[PDB]
Amino acid sequence: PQMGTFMGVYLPCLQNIFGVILFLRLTWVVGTAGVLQAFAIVLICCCCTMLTAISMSAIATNGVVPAGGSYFMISRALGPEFGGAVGLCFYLGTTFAAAMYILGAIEIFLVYIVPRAAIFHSDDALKESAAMLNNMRVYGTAFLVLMVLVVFIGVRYVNKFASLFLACVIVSILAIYAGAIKSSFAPPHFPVCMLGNRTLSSRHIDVCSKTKEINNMTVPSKLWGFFCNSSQFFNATCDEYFVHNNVTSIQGIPGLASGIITENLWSNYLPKGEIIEKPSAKSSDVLGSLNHEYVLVDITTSFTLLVGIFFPSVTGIMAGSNRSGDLKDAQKSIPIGTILAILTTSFVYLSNVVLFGACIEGVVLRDKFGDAVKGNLVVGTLSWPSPWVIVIGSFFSTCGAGLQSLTGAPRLLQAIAKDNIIPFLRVFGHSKANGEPTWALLLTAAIAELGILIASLDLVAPILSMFFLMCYLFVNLACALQTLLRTPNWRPRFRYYHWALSFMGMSICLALMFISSWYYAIVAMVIAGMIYKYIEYQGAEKEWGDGIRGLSLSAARFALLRLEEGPPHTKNWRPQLLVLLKLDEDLHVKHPRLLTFASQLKAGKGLTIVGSVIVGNFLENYGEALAAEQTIKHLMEAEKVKGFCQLVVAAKLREGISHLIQSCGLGGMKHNTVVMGWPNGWRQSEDARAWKTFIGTVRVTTAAHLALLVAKNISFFPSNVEQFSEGNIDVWWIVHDGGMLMLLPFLLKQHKVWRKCSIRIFTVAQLEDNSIQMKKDLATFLYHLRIEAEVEVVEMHDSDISAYTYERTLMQSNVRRMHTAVKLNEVIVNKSHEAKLVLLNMPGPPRNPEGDENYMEFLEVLTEGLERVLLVRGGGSEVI
Amino acid sequence: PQMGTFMGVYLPCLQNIFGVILFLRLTWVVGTAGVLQAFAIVLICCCCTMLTAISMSAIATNGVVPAGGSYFMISRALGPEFGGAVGLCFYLGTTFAAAMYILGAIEIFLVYIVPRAAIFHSDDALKESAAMLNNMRVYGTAFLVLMVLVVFIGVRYVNKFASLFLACVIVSILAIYAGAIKSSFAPPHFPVCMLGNRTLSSRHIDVCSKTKEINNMTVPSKLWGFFCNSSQFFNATCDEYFVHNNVTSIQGIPGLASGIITENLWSNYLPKGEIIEKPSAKSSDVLGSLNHEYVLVDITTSFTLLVGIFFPSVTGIMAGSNRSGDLKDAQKSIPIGTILAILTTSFVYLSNVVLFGACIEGVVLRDKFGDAVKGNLVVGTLSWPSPWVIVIGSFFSTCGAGLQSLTGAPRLLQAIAKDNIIPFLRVFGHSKANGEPTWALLLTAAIAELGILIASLDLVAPILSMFFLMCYLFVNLACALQTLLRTPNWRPRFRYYHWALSFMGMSICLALMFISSWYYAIVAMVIAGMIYKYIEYQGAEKEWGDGIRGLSLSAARFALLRLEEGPPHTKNWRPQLLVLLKLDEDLHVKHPRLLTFASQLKAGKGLTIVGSVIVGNFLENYGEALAAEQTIKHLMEAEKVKGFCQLVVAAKLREGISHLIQSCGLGGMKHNTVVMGWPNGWRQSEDARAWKTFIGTVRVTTAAHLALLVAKNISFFPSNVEQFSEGNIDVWWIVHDGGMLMLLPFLLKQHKVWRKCSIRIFTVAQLEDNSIQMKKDLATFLYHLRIEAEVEVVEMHDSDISAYTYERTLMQSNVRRMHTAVKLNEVIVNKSHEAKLVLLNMPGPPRNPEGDENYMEFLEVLTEGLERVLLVRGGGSEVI
């Protein structure tokens, strides 16, 4: 239950990074690329996996850190959509890792431990490619089944013997560094033999000279047998290169004392079949083609090739947090414990590339399989007790790392199958009584089987470096997006984190990807995308019922929850129309001209809600309401309205109209303003209370602080077919109106019906001077990008607007308003009679209930027979 | 006003496809790639631009076809977001097209018309690269300014002389095909001179022989001067290749009579500097390095290179619909008129590649600049009247095509600047009184300037083929997506259209892209994406006010409008919770345990609405309602509810509860079911009407056909902290219940509080036998993937459920129900006393108003002291 950072998340991490590649291909990377370009591989590979440990640390700090495995930390903190992608690529990469580790174990056993037994002997000098490949196919499968049966049965022992496998590593890594300081001031004896700039394989021949001093008869040596025709007299019919050159035996370990970095420095990339030349020896250019017993370039090499080969040496960081459920401070361990394991595995890798180039001669650094040093490991030469310490040691370490890599594949595939997120793999979840599978173990054995039929570590490693790069990409991608877009419930409370650092790791992992193999690279990213979306589809067929419509519902809810963070009043104002249509008996809209006019503002634009009310007794007329809404649905689509319908069968009219103002639009998507018709047959029989319901709407919108745009003379409104040409539009400004009265004429002219019309700004002045006040307007037109308007000032008497300045200070006398209604309308018609639309301000209604006539006869004079006029007013807005 | 298909959309299309490439590089494509691989370029280029004409035809048929230019057809029918991308790439490609056409005009004038005048003479034998390049920089700019001033001033003439430019084409294309049939049975005289497999430039030398028969003294010829040391005696110190070989003069036009396709067939790709060898001649391998007067490979060639060079020969299909506003049947023209122009331009291109290989010798087909045929155009040899007909003709045609290509760039950039969609380029919109710019013409002159500083047709053409491929990609991409995703207002009423055909064109245009130049390819697609999104951002800062929040609002509305197409009842059922909380004075929630329980079903899941009502007089207590909703907001987030709030200050309680059931959730996002508390202190003082408001909710949900889940004993509900372990959960089945009663226990166990609990299915049987009825259940558990439940049947008497079968047939006696309430509850407690939750069915309420007690004392007995029980009922659902 109680673990620590050291033995909890550091040692299982450091177990799963040091492995075969430090022993089996590292010096070959050192010798081929030189010091400098092999120095360039490791820093582009270590910093590829440092940045992922940072992005995983932000997953570590943020969240709850669920107990058990790293995958649940990856799944719960990024949504299950990425857990399908990152959880699956790390599966496939781990299955090859068990195959690559077991392939390295056969390679060292068949070369170094037992070179003698080989079931597929080379039948000729060039069968060595096929003979070695056909070894690795028929051998590792014989040891693959052994591995699977002991992870199926002896799973108790392998949990116990994990300390020895790390112990096999730790004694094997020191012995390099111990024997390294020994060769300084005391190099051991490992002679190599040379002939010309090229050299020769020293396997069978013991002593190298052109002759052989036998006690009384100096014979030509075995080299004469391996270069001339036969083993015979010292005579002709020999080579042209062996004759004109001489046999040289030099030291392959010149120690740290020599200057080697300055000479063994440059790139040595060669095509396949090239004989391993030394850059400093004497040679006679006689050009023999004599390839019997030599040393060659085994496969063709390049710089981009060695990156895809070296890269599985650094992998295994997701195994650093496999024991999260046993920790005590997991939000503090997983950043600290893992990155410090990265810093100690980069320190080893950068050291030995220097330490190999400064102590071992570069010609045997190109030598694969230790062929010039008589089947000794090139690392093992630098081992102070014995090479057998490393050879038996590095055999066990890649054995146990393969023993480790089978536990995870079987375990992980249950965790996705128990997650039930893909129904294709529901069958894999059937575990035993103790958490071991029989189907995931069948899948892991079958996928790792294909790597043995590849039968070469230098072709498995580029494929294996692909899948781990697919995970390390989508870890950095998902950490960057949720930090940039601010996906809800994502708070990375980590010190050393920034969003662009995962973005920089997102680019490098993509740069590593195409450079390896491009037609593998595209098919990797495309098969990743369609499995990603197939998660997102099957979220809908579980949660929102079924179908493809739920994905739009899910994306709707995922958007609507986002606006609940901030305030809706941050910067700007736009009208979002709630219109409401009165319905008589045999229910039809009383005035569709609003629904024309509403679309004559926000055509193909924002939130539009149509309002509607039916009176009395919801309990039976519901099917009528199902029928009445369809009338509007085929009426909104007729007049190009892309909006939403709301129909309520309330009891009383005053109740429904109050409700739809305060209860339309869920959540952050709210309507912003109300557009309403007019009680037209006003001074009539019974509708005086219905007139007061029109008054009752006004005091609602003041209390709800929502703008109101009520139309007058509604039948005389232009349809959506006809157009207008050359009619003026007037606003009538008061300083408390706001930028609606500026913005609303601008929104009108964008529609084609109100296109060819002129704008006459007829402002009402209450102050004295106009020139600064007209400058105040012309400043706004330079600000509001709508300088097409033309201004004109009027002012008569500030007592004639005592109906308005009484409200402005609040920002008989009611009879004193009614004389001033007539006097102001005389001004309006005399400058704007033939107006195709008028914009008038709607004043503040009285707080008194018997200010009903005191407000409305004042307004019916204020509509002194005008053609088209909107009475507007709004509250608390900003237009920038 | 009235145009036709022929002279309207066909001839302006056919004008803008035939151009320079048929005359200046086509034969060089024929000679280099052979017949077969040059045959492969044209079919991957013609079918690249056929499929775009189909996808443009679906834009042509669907929609209104606005008058004026192709861009408005592209913009209005795909949203303005793609019109930023497709409208801009077609601008940049057109600017280079004016530069590439004018560069070809200088090339033919400086080689073929006037070879004599050249301001930058070659100072040595290898200055020919730099001298020719420095010609094209200093010449075309002198003719660039001439082109700009006449499109600025003489724009009236160039509208008139467009018929002559097509007339320059049509007489020039026939003269190939006229002179082609002439060389069959009557080839003209165009001799070529050969020496070995290689050959020589025939510019200066007239007659070729190793000597020169002067009337009485046969001198060694000029070739002796161009191969040996000097012009001297017939002696030594000569070449080793000219001496051992001989001068051969053969025919370069062997006509259609010879078998040439069978011999001139294979690929002739050579590196730069290679001497043009004939594959069939006699040669002496003496290896001179004598490169004075020869013929060479001018630039290095490859198959992927010639595709990016040939491709601007097929471009110009967006100019096929530039005159849409003058048509009469534009929805029928633009499919028919354009594709038939594609069929007649593919017919020419495929013919001449055959006709060149079957009539002209392949060695002069590799010959650029007509150097072996004494500065004659290789096409012009096949011209029956004169080569000067083609040479003057193809000069004028690429002149007028360059004269055309300046009108569009200036015109198009206004149309985007008048669209105001990018504020960075608002300044470009300032036209003159007649639609000509001064800033777009400044931008078009400056962008085309850079191509002249490239000064080579074979480097401009790969860059020019990039931008036109960027448009032809995003045309096919946008046509495929809106057809697959079904974006609203997208109905392609075209015959010969399918969605995958634009998808196949989407792949090929992307295949053409990376193969040209990959590091140009990525930077093209990335600078396309961020300009695309920058349109989508600035839609929000104009429409939804401002900010980045409007993009989520816009994506919300774009999703909510989509569900208005189909029915919500297509396949499946899921609960979408509307919960409602009663609020007393000093307003707090009476029972938060619902809000625990609601999240104990849909945790991190779908639509959740909380319901709430305040009584009386909205006109002043609005700030309280602003305060009361914040109580719930910090209460829903406390109990892990990601849902939405609705608060109404209504008058009476019955009015508000009826309203929020029928008016919550805008549009397609509707709540599906109601969860409600219980009138707990039931038989008490005043709340009998408040009890009937609880009854009043029941008859609402029947009429609205929405499911109801009312909880009993609400204080005895487990919180979200505690857990449960080993308690049974019972449902109680009636055949008219529905799969809710099956699905609801399954939804409970997924939460961790209801995790470790058992499921006992206690069904109520009304029939006789149970074995088939239990088989009917076990069939459902095999169907519903939830076989963890365990069943048990009861049946006593069907008269004891006369309270239910009276309702089932509808799918004293009220007192006769009340005796049967006691008898059924005896069954419930005797098998399910220690139940941590009970699921009971809620029966149908009476239609009579005085069935108030007749329904509820029957139910209060039905909750005979049980711990936790939900009374559920729902109507008209499907669970699959």
Ligand SMILES: *[C@@H]1O[C@H](CO)[C@@H](O)[C@H](O)[C@H]1NC(C)=O
């Ligand atoms: C090769 O080595 C021999 C020593 O046996 C020496 O005599 C001879 O000069 C050498 N040849 C060279 C250095 O070319």
Ligand SMILES: *[C@@H]1O[C@H](CO)[C@@H](O)[C@H](O)[C@H]1NC(C)=O
């Ligand atoms: C060895 O010598 C040959 C000629 O003797 C030379 O051309 C070759 O480059 C040399 N090899 C090296 C320097 O690796």
Ligand SMILES: *[C@@H]1O[C@H](CO)[C@@H](O)[C@H](O)[C@H]1NC(C)=O
């Ligand atoms: C080259 O041509 C001459 C004709 O002047 C002929 O005599 C000679 O044999 C030819 N050489 C060949 C075909 O190798």
Ligand SMILES: *[C@@H]1O[C@H](CO)[C@@H](O)[C@H](O)[C@H]1NC(C)=O
């Ligand atoms: C011409 O002849 C040389 C040798 O005489 C030959 O190697 C070369 O391939 C020939 N050129 C061709 C066939 O194009």
